[PDB]
Structures are given as structure tokens and as C-alpha cells.
Design an enzyme around this catalytic site. Structure first.
Site, PDB file in Angstrom:
ATOM      1  N   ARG A   1      65.423  89.197  57.883  1.00  0.00           N
ATOM      2  CA  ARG A   1      64.639  90.401  57.595  1.00  0.00           C
ATOM      3  C   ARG A   1      65.286  91.711  58.064  1.00  0.00           C
ATOM      4  NH1 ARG A   1      59.026  89.221  56.717  1.00  0.00           N
ATOM      5  NH2 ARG A   1      58.442  90.716  58.384  1.00  0.00           N
TER       6      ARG A   1
ATOM      7  N   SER B   1      74.351 104.762  72.230  1.00  0.00           N
ATOM      8  CA  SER B   1      72.961 104.961  71.902  1.00  0.00           C
ATOM      9  C   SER B   1      72.185 103.661  71.754  1.00  0.00           C
ATOM     10  CB  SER B   1      72.831 105.811  70.638  1.00  0.00           C
ATOM     11  OG  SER B   1      72.843 104.995  69.485  1.00  0.00           O
TER      12      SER B   1
ATOM     13  N   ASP C   1      56.546 101.337  65.824  1.00  0.00           N
ATOM     14  CA  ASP C   1      55.524 101.131  64.830  1.00  0.00           C
ATOM     15  C   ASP C   1      54.866 102.453  64.462  1.00  0.00           C
ATOM     16  OD1 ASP C   1      53.558 100.201  63.102  1.00  0.00           O
ATOM     17  OD2 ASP C   1      52.619  98.859  64.588  1.00  0.00           O
TER      18      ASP C   1
ATOM     19  N   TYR D   1      50.071  93.007  71.014  1.00  0.00           N
ATOM     20  CA  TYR D   1      51.185  93.545  70.228  1.00  0.00           C
ATOM     21  C   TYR D   1      51.236  95.070  70.358  1.00  0.00           C
ATOM     22  CZ  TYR D   1      53.964  95.076  66.225  1.00  0.00           C
ATOM     23  OH  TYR D   1      54.899  95.707  65.417  1.00  0.00           O
TER      24      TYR D   1
ATOM     25  N   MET E   1      50.055  97.012  72.519  1.00  0.00           N
ATOM     26  CA  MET E   1      50.377  97.432  73.867  1.00  0.00           C
ATOM     27  C   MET E   1      51.888  97.419  74.043  1.00  0.00           C
ATOM     28  SD  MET E   1      47.305  95.650  76.077  1.00  0.00           S
ATOM     29  CE  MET E   1      47.951  96.162  77.667  1.00  0.00           C
TER      30      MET E   1
ATOM     31  N   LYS F   1      54.186  97.655  71.655  1.00  0.00           N
ATOM     32  CA  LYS F   1      54.703  98.768  70.869  1.00  0.00           C
ATOM     33  C   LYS F   1      54.446 100.140  71.514  1.00  0.00           C
ATOM     34  CE  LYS F   1      56.927  96.454  67.779  1.00  0.00           C
ATOM     35  NZ  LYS F   1      58.428  96.477  67.754  1.00  0.00           N
TER      36      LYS F   1
END
Ligand SMILES: NC(=O)c1ccc[n+]([C@@H]2O[C@H](COP(=O)([O-])OP(=O)(O)OC[C@H]3O[C@@H](n4cnc5c(N)ncnc54)[C@H](OP(=O)(O)O)[C@@H]3O)[C@@H](O)[C@H]2O)c1
Ligand SMILES: NC(=O)c1ccc[n+]([C@@H]2O[C@H](COP(=O)([O-])OP(=O)(O)OC[C@H]3O[C@@H](n4cnc5c(N)ncnc54)[C@H](OP(=O)(O)O)[C@@H]3O)[C@@H](O)[C@H]2O)c1
Ligand SMILES: NC(=O)c1ccc[n+]([C@@H]2O[C@H](COP(=O)([O-])OP(=O)(O)OC[C@H]3O[C@@H](n4cnc5c(N)ncnc54)[C@H](OP(=O)(O)O)[C@@H]3O)[C@@H](O)[C@H]2O)c1
Ligand SMILES: NC(=O)c1ccc[n+]([C@@H]2O[C@H](COP(=O)([O-])OP(=O)(O)OC[C@H]3O[C@@H](n4cnc5c(N)ncnc54)[C@H](OP(=O)(O)O)[C@@H]3O)[C@@H](O)[C@H]2O)c1
Ligand SMILES: Nc1nc(=O)c2nc(CNc3ccc(C(=O)N[C@@H](CCC(=O)O)C(=O)O)cc3)cnc2[nH]1
Ligand SMILES: Nc1nc(=O)c2nc(CNc3ccc(C(=O)N[C@@H](CCC(=O)O)C(=O)O)cc3)cnc2[nH]1
Ligand SMILES: Nc1nc(=O)c2nc(CNc3ccc(C(=O)N[C@@H](CCC(=O)O)C(=O)O)cc3)cnc2[nH]1
Ligand SMILES: Nc1nc(=O)c2nc(CNc3ccc(C(=O)N[C@@H](CCC(=O)O)C(=O)O)cc3)cnc2[nH]1
Lengths: 248, 249, 249, 248
Positions: A13, A135, A141, A154, A156, A158
Site C-alpha cells: 500500500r 528529515s 491523519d 488509534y 490518540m 495519531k
């Protein structure tokens, strides 16, 4: 000499597309994976066939535990062993599933979700910095402030990632290390998700009524690691087709 | 019957002032504490002397571990045992120290800082919800989340995680009539260890009065958020910072 | 056929660098200016010397008035007359001075500051859209919009309004395939008037390199936003600030 | 002696509830209005019947023009003439209608929307400050970052208002003047709006699937002007039932 990048969760992905595109730009890459050994090695093959000795795999579970600092140190160490340097870290790997407030144990859920999306990125950042156009790019998100129902752990992670992006940017700037973020709205949807629910998300998107390809996400990462972004740090670029701007 | 509130880390400073003021409004309170047994029991005595059987102490370490869910369940259970109900949860307890990127182990640092500021609040939220008027949770946040002090990565992550929880819980618990909100101090009572000159440097930064918030001023916002004057408010984080977060470098 | 871009306030500094770099990418450009005729024409010559018939100047005051819609319509029209098309609009021109709350009239101050930073961009956006490939608008914002300078209320209002427009236009124009985004400088080229010691005070504030962005570094982000590497990006505002906005008081 | 507040657009809806509640707390109030003379004076009578000489009306158009600074100065001046002081300014009056990008002229649209939501509040703030528990409260929008479709000019005003709230907070704090905001999500819906559209918004709200009453909005204003908020400045409190947190 060519620069070198670590991409976590790079077998499939978005992780794969980041790794590929970094390679196409001229990076040697460490493809990190957890369960997807076949796919990770397959990508290493494909990339090494293009240019020899420019891709290696590295296996590690990024779940929070007592071995995690050591594991993250070893991911950064493998980039130095293979390529003699580590110029870029892309924090991509991420556990993603509902944790409703109302058969994993909740402490496992915490460990996987906070571990992958926040703590691993934190420890990886520590090592990356310790070992030294440098970098770090964290996958965030665009929906952190409009989370999905029952995804609190999740979300939290992010949110913690946003905090880390900004804090590391600030602390690592005297080291010439830029820390930034790329925030997908809806990109490649979970393989499990039915097509009907995929479509309901697609219709929500103002720009084209479709999800981002993994390559469009990768494009922003490429920009952030390039010399076109030398002054950019602590910046999180939404690549979301305007989704976060849509009211309920 | 009087409503009942859990305040974590309530033995001193901001936690104590929240607990006192909740009590003065008419709440029975559970004073949670970790190391400050003497001060927590002292406050229970002071509050019970004012009205009998309205204050209890609860000891628990909020460090992350596999037993923290059990610990957090027991904190909420303590309020139900003492008072037969739990109307309010204030997530105040917080580990706070630098964790530079460049003698605790990092695994302990992670556990204490993420555990106290985020995971405990999450688990406590879970229990509060499952165990169920005007029900509401109030999380102590940080008006400086987006302008963190240098080398406070882990702390800042917890506080950011707290913002995420405040919003996510608000959203998920609203069908249960449970409001979830936050109070975000800029500089309030400064660490007791911090030297006075360092304290002054922060004070001068504050636009409104060149001083820190009293613990009372922080508590005031909490009181507002738990009251009937806030029945429609949820997923809101009120800065109580004297304009600090607005000041450029 | 080569695409065409309008850059407002393109005679000097950041506007000039945006116009130059767009040209170097392959755009034909309309150099908008207000006072700086000499510099605007000079840049048109320089660019046309490089490739013939690829640069034109366009004079307009972007102060708010009842003729501003007409003026903004004419800027967009100038790009269509010169180049037969208009693919990109960069909203750069901006009045910038203090307007303390406590010899221009306040009427004029409002008109200049809100006119340039918000209303002109709004009207230009209207015409750009109405007159219609990779179409996109880029607004120059302010990474410090939430930590404004003291006594810069009107300016800060314009810039906040610009944020609102960036997001609203993004949302409304997305069915037209028109992407609307923003580039937010912290401290870039500082005002020519500003003394060197004040310039240095800002420079020291910057985490990444203790210097201001060159106009070229700001332009770089604009180039990215208008490119095919940003086809899915809209309603995004990219800070190009060296970490400035992240530094507490 | 009792403190005195100016509430702009106070004849109806949220403005009226703010004015009423301020009065109930013990403020003398200047009810500002534009077209709603009947309703404005009706409220003045109701309030003066409760306590004599505690309510006055004040007519002014808050549309942007070269006379608007003078108009705003006169609103503040009316509070001083009536009550000998001005302790509180509530910026409530607001023009609200679509301005699509693709029979008013657009210059009128700009003037009404930017004038009411931003410039008037700016000028009123200037006068309030120049004439001196002092505090200003601006009515914002919890949806300012998830605007409605085609409401660009309105949304710009509201974003400008956010800017003003923070800039005035910062500049006026040495004067002991606190500047804050109350941000309704969905409150009293436009009287014109049909009931089924009203319902579509109501269903969106997590907390109770209903809009805020004007009184619930007023409650937050009351808190912000009180001694329970003495340290609060440049804060914008959402009173939105969680609406802004709901993804598309
Ligand atoms: N896709 C979207 O619409 C979207 C939207 C917003 C943000 N993002 C962010 O963008 C990033 C990539 O998205 P994605 O959809 O490609 O993610 P994904 O497929 O769900 O996960 C990426 C990889 O993370 C690795 N991973 C999961 N749990 C792990 C663990 N416990 N330890 C170590 N590795 C683990 C997996 O590696 P293995 O397969 O090798 O086991 C997986 O292939 C993520 O950070 C995500 O949160 C994505
Ligand atoms: N003070 C400020 O300027 C400021 C600024 C922004 C945000 N805040 C937030 O407001 C809240 C209160 O501030 P404060 O200064 O009063 O906090 P604090 O004194 O530093 O901490 C509050 C209490 O947290 C408890 N605690 C610490 N580690 C714990 C652990 N591992 N397990 C269980 N409890 C633990 C302690 O209880 P025991 O003493 O009983 O051990 C302590 O008394 C905190 O959430 C803080 O982050 C404060
Ligand atoms: N420089 C920074 O540190 C910084 C920081 C944050 C944001 N920004 C933003 O980035 C953009 C460019 O910055 P800059 O420093 O290059 O800007 P600038 O030199 O101050 O202004 C750019 C141009 O705007 C034009 N302008 C001013 N008033 C006008 C009016 N009433 N009508 C029409 N045009 C007018 C001027 O054109 P003429 O000279 O031809 O008259 C001027 O050359 C601005 O939008 C700015 O707010 C800059
Ligand atoms: N209602 C909501 O769901 C909602 C949501 C978010 C934010 N808000 C904000 O909350 C505030 C009050 O909301 P609301 O629904 O009560 O507002 P509203 O009824 O639509 O407007 C309030 C008053 O503003 C005055 N006004 C309009 N144009 C004016 C002009 N050109 N000059 C002078 N006055 C003018 C009108 O006074 P006259 O009638 O006397 O002419 C009107 O009664 C507004 O700032 C609004 O934007 C409301
Ligand atoms: N790591 C990661 N992977 C993703 O696939 C992902 N996707 C998004 C946007 N995608 C999503 C995907 C699913 C749902 C959701 O409702 N998921 C349910 C699936 C329900 C179903 O399949 O019917 C889930 O069980 O995860 C929400 C947002 C955001 N962050 C991500 N992060
Ligand atoms: N839990 C918690 N307690 C606090 O005292 C606290 N204080 C603030 C604002 N206070 C602070 C306090 C200290 C430093 C700081 O530089 N602390 C150093 C002390 C250095 C010294 O004492 O000389 C530290 O070691 O903590 C930054 C912000 C924000 N959140 C808090 N959170
Ligand atoms: N249009 C525009 N031009 C700029 O030069 C600019 N600069 C910044 C960052 N620059 C600044 C520049 C000056 C001051 C300031 O204090 N300006 C005083 C100058 C004081 C002096 O020169 O001593 C002024 O009068 O403008 C603050 C931020 C942000 N937006 C801008 N926007
Ligand atoms: N000044 C002001 N008045 C309001 O009534 C208001 N309402 C909201 C939330 N309300 C709304 C109300 C209507 C629409 C809307 O679609 N309005 C169309 C009405 C369409 C119809 O009535 O069928 C409009 O013409 O205004 C969006 C958000 C936010 N700010 C406000 N601000």
C-alpha cells in the site's frame, strides 16, 4: 554517494509507494515489515533489479514493549549497516482497528495502536537523531479532529504523532533535522472493507469523489524530503481532496 | 442525593483545588492520589469535617502496565462503593518531566508519561462509561500543546493524546448523555522545584496580568464545564491561559 | 500550449520570486503591481528576454472599494487577453502595517488591509472561477496567524479571512477541478524599513537555521502546490516557517 | 452601581437571550438593533418593567462603509450616555446568506457580511477600548473550519472574527480587557429554513440530536463575562453538542 531512507511498514500500500518513489528519486531504502515478509522481499528484489544493492528488508514488531526501544534502534542500525548512512526516516507502519469505549486484551490494543502510531515513531526518531538534507516524515491523519466512531486508541496515537512531529521539529532543528507530516484523508481503503462502504467514503470527497492513490500520498513525502522543502519543518500537509473540510 | 466526582491526583495543587471546589458546589468526592497519602487524607478530613461522609481517598499508580485497566476500574468502583454513583470524572493526575531525544529507562518514561496523561484517562473513561442527571468528564490539557517546551516529547505526546481522547470520547459518549471536555492551563502553579527566576520568566510572558493562574481559576472552568450552564458543551477545550498561547516567540 | 499564471504584487520580494519560478517551470505570467511600475516592467523584460511574449504587467489597486470587483475582473481578463487562458492564480499582494486599537483614516486602514489580504483574493477567486488541465489557486497566508504581532489586528483579520477563503473556495471549487491551497511564511524577507537589529531578533527566534526564508524557499512551496505532485491537495495550508510558529513565548 | 453591557443585534434570537440573561445577572443593557425596532423596544420595556432605567435601544446599520466607524463609536457612546459606563461588549449582530463563487451587488454582499461579522466588531472593539471586570465576547462559529457550501464571505467574516478575538485579547490585556468568543454549532436555525432541513442538521448533533437553545449559548457568554473567567482571554468556547467533531 546516494542517500538512504528507512520506511516502516513498507511491504504494501502507501508504505510501498513511498519506498518505491524514494528509490526512483535516488534513495537506497530499508523496507521495514512485520508480517509481510513475502511482499517486502518481493519489493527489495524489484528495486535491486533496477539498481543493485540499493534495497534491504528489516523485520520488527512495532508494538509497545520492553524490547521496542531496542527494536527501533536496530531498524536505524540496519540502514547504517547496509548503506553507511541514514538520511530519511518515514514513519508509516500503523495498526488500525476499532477500540470501542463501551479478542485482544485492552492492554494489547493500547500496545499495538499507541506503539505503532506514536511510541515507535518516537523511539525511531530518538535513534535516527542519535546516530547522526536530513528529515523525518510522519504519516498522520487529516481526520484527527473528526475521528471515526469508536477509534479512540488509534486517534490518540495519531494525535500523539502530531505532538511528536511538532516537538521533534523544534528539538531537532539545531541538528538540521526537519520533521514533517503527511496527512491522508481517505487513501487506499482497508482491503477488508466492503465496496459499498468504500463508496460512501469516496462520495464524501470534494475533489474528484475518489480516494488518493498511494502515489499521491508518496508525492507529498517526496516534496518534504527534497531541497524544495529546506525551510519546512513541523508542517503537516493534508493530502485529502478537501475531506476534512466537509461538515457532517 | 448529592452527585459524586472522581478527581485523579487530587492531593495537592490543581487537583486539590478542583476537588475542594467540586465539594463546595455540593459534590461528594473521591480524592485519588499516588504518593501523597498524608496530603490526600488531610484533604479528606478537612472536607468530611465540613460535611460528614462526603470524601474518600483512593490510592493507585497510573503508570501504564497490564494491570492499569484493573487499577482504573477500581478507582471508578471506589466512587460507586463510597457514594453509590459516579457523576463526574476529572482527569488531573499527570507525570511531568523532560525526555530529551538526544536514571529511568525510556520504557519507564513512556509508561509514566503516556500512562498518566493519556492511557489512564482512556481507561478511566471506559470504566466511567460502562458503570452507568448531568454526567461529564473533564480532562486537564495544555494550552501550550502546539508550542511545547523543549525536550518534553513524551509529555507533549500524552497531552496531544489527551486532546484526541477528549474529542473521541465526546463523540462516542454523547448518545449516553456523557459530556467530555477539557480545561487547558497555560502556566498555572509552577513546579515546586523550579527556581523563582525561572518562574518569573514564564510570568512575564503572560499578557493578562503577568502572573500564573491560581489553582482556583483552573478549577472555576472545571466547575463551569460540569454545571448545567454547560449542558450543550462537549468536545470543547477551554484555555485558561491569560493569553499565553497567543504570544509569538 | 504553455499554461498561464497571475501573481498579484509580483514586482518585488516574494511575489517576484513566485513569478520568476513559475516562469522557469514553464508558465507565462501576468505580473500584477500597484506602485512598483519600474520594477514590474523590469521583470517583464527579464522574463521576455528569456522567452518572447511570456510576460505582461497589469496595474491595479487592490484596496477595497465599489470598483474593486471590476478591478479584479480586469486582472483575470488581462491574463486571458495576453495568454488566452488562466491556469493559476497566486494571491500575494498585501498591505502590512500596525493598526493599534488604542495619518490614514481607520476607513482607509480597513480598506487597504482587509481589501488586499482578503477581499481582493475573494474577488479574484470569483473571476478566476467564472472565466473557466491543472487549475489551482495559491494564497499567501501567515504561519503566525494564531500568534499575531502586537497591534496588527486589521492585518491579522485579513490573513484569518484568507484562511477562511482558502478553505471555502477549496470546498466550493473542487467540483470544477480547481484546487485552492495556501503557503504560510513565518518570517521571510523582512520589511525593507525594519532596522537590522529588529530583523536579527526575529531571526534568532527561528529553530531551523536562525534565519528567514528566502523568497525562493516560499516560491518552492507554491511551485509544489501548482504541480502534478499535488493533484489531490486542496484546502491545505503549508507552513514554510523554519519551526517559528512552534516556539512558545 | 450596576455594570453595563452592549449587545449588538439584540432584538431577537441569540442576541435577545444574551441581553436578557446579562440583565438577569444584574447588567444594564443597550439593545442594539437594525431593522427590528418593534422587537428591540418590546425587550427594552420588558426589561425596564423588571427594573426601571436599565434598558435602552440603539439603532445602527453595521454594514461596512465610510460612516461605520462613526456608527460604532455612537453605539459605545450611547451606553456611556445611558449608563455612565460600558463594562461589556457582546458582538452578536451578523448578516448571513450564501455568496456563491460561481439581487445584491457583490460589493454590497462584501459590505454586509464582512462588515457585520468582522469590521463592526473591530470598530466597536476600538471604541470600547478607547472610552475606558471589562471583557468583550464575540459570537463565532464552531463550523468555521467546516463551512457550508457557498458561504465564502460569511465564513471569511467569521474567520476574521477569530483573528480579532485573538489579536484584541493580546493587545487589550494590559488594559485588563479580556476578549473571548462563543462558537455555536447549530443553534436557533434561520426562521426561513424549512423544518426538514432543520431536522437534517439536528440529526447530525451527537449530544441530544437537537440545536442549542439561545439560552445555552447565552450561558457561555455569562460565564465569560463573570469572575469565574478572570484569567480567560483569547479563548473561543464551542457550544456545539459535538457537531464540529463529526466527520462527513
Ligand atoms: N489508508 C488511508 O486511507 C489512510 C488515511 C489516513 C492516514 N493513513 C496513514 O498512512 C499510513 C499508511 O497507511 P496504510 O493504509 O498503507 O496502512 P496499513 O496498510 O494499514 O499499515 C501499514 C503497515 O503497518 C505495519 N504494521 C501494522 N501493525 C504493526 C505492528 N504492530 N508492528 C509493526 N508494523 C505494523 C504493517 O506491516 P506488515 O504488513 O508487514 O505486517 C502494514 O503493512 C498509516 O500510518 C496510516 O495511519 C492512511
Ligand atoms: N501546572 C501547570 O502550569 C499546568 C499547565 C498545563 C497543564 N497542566 C495540567 O493540569 C494538571 C494538574 O497540574 P499540576 O501542576 O497540579 O500537576 P502535578 O502536581 O505535577 O501532578 C498532579 C498529580 O499527579 C499525580 N501523579 C503523577 N504521577 C503519577 C503516576 N505515575 N500515577 C498516578 N498519579 C500520578 C501526583 O499525585 P501524588 O502527589 O499523590 O503522587 C500529582 O500530585 C496536570 O494534568 C497538568 O499536566 C498544568
Ligand atoms: N515577508 C514575510 O516575512 C511574510 C510573512 C508571512 C506572510 N507573508 C505574506 O506573503 C506575501 C508576500 O510577502 P512580501 O513581504 O513580499 O509582501 P510585501 O512586499 O509587503 O507586499 C507585496 C506587494 O503587495 C502589493 N500591495 C500592497 N498594497 C497594495 C494595494 N493596496 N493594492 C494592490 N497591491 C498592493 C505591493 O505592490 P507594489 O509594490 O507594486 O505597490 C507589494 O509589492 C504577502 O501576502 C504577505 O502577507 C509574508
Ligand atoms: N444561529 C446559529 O445556529 C449560529 C451558529 C453559529 C454562529 N452563530 C452566530 O451567533 C450570532 C447570533 O446568531 P443568530 O442566529 O441569532 O443571528 P441572526 O438572527 O441571523 O442575526 C442577529 C441580528 O444581526 C443583526 N444584523 C444583521 N445584519 C445587520 C446589519 N447589516 N447591520 C446591523 N445589524 C445586522 C439583525 O438585527 P435586526 O433584526 O434588528 O435587523 C439580526 O437580528 C451571530 O453572530 C451568528 O453568526 C449562530
Ligand atoms: N493504518 C491505517 N489504515 C487504514 O486503512 C486507514 N484508513 C483511514 C481512512 N479509512 C477508514 C477505514 C475504515 C473505517 C472503518 O469504519 N473501518 C472499519 C471497517 C468497517 C467495515 O469494513 O465494514 C474497521 O473495522 O476498521 C474508517 C476509516 C484512516 N487511517 C487509516 N490508517
Ligand atoms: N503535570 C504538570 N505539571 C506542571 O508543573 C506543569 N507545568 C506546565 C507549565 N510549566 C512548565 C514548568 C516547567 C518547565 C521546565 O522548563 N521544567 C523543567 C524545570 C527547569 C528548572 O526547574 O530549572 C523541568 O525539569 O521540569 C516548562 C513548563 C505545564 N504542564 C505541567 N504539567
Ligand atoms: N505583507 C507582509 N509584509 C511583510 O513584510 C510581512 N512580514 C511578516 C513577518 N514580519 C514582521 C515584520 C515586522 C513586524 C513589525 O514589528 N513591524 C513594524 C516594524 C517595526 C520596526 O521596523 O522597527 C512595522 O511598522 O511594520 C512584525 C512582523 C509577516 N507578514 C508580512 N506581510
Ligand atoms: N448569523 C447567523 N445566522 C444563522 O441562522 C446561522 N446559522 C448557522 C448554522 N445554520 C445554518 C443555517 C442554514 C444553512 C443553509 O443551508 N442555509 C440556507 C438555507 C437553505 C434553506 O433554507 O433551504 C440559506 O439560504 O441561508 C447552513 C447553516 C450558522 N451561523 C449562523 N449565523
Amino acid at each position: 554517494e546516494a542517500p538512504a531512507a528507512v520506511v516502516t511498514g513498507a511491504a504494501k500500500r502507501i508504505g510501498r509507494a513511498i519506498a518505491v518513489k524514494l528509490h526512483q528519486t535516488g534513495y537506497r531504502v530499508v523496507i521495514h515489515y512485520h508480517n509481510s515478509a513475502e511482499a517486502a522481499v518481493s519489493l527489495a528484489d524489484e528495486l535491486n533489479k533496477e539498481r543493485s544493492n540499493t534495497a534491504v528488508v528489516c523485520q520488527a514488531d512495532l508494538t509497545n514493549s520492553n524490547v521496542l526501544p531496542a527494536s527501533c534502534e536496530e531498524i536505524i542500525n540496519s540502514c547504517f549497516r547496509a548503506f553507511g548512512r541514514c538520511d530519511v526516516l518515514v514513519n508509516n507502519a500503523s495498526a488500525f482497528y476499532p477500540t470501542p469505549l463501551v479478542g485482544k486484551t485492552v492492554e494489547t490494543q493500547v500496545a499495538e495502536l499507541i506503539g505503532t502510531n506514536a511510541i515507535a515513531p518516537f523511539l525511531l526518531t530518538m535513534s535516527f537523531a542519535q546516530r547522526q538534507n536530513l528529515s523525518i516524515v510522519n504519516l498522520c491523519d487529516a481526520m484527527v479532529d473528526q475521528p471515526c466512531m469508536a477509534f479512540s486508541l488509534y486517534n490518540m496515537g495519531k494525535h500523539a504523532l502530531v505532538g511528536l512531529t511538532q516537538s521533534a521539529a523544534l528539538e531537532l532543528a539545531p541538528y538540521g533535522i526537519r520533521v514533517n507530516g503527511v496527512a491522508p484523508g481517505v487513501s487506499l481503503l482497508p482491503v477488508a472493507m466492503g465496496e459499498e462502504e468504500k463508496d460512501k467514503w469516496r462520495r464524501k470527497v470534494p475533489l474528484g469523489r475518489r480516494e488518493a492513490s498511494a502515489e499521491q500520498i508518496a508525492d507529498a513525502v517526496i516534496f518534504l524530503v527534497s531541497g524544495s522543502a529546506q525551510y519546512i519543518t513541523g508542517s503537516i500537509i493534508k493530502v485529502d481532496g478537501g475531506l476534512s473540510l466537509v461538515h457532517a
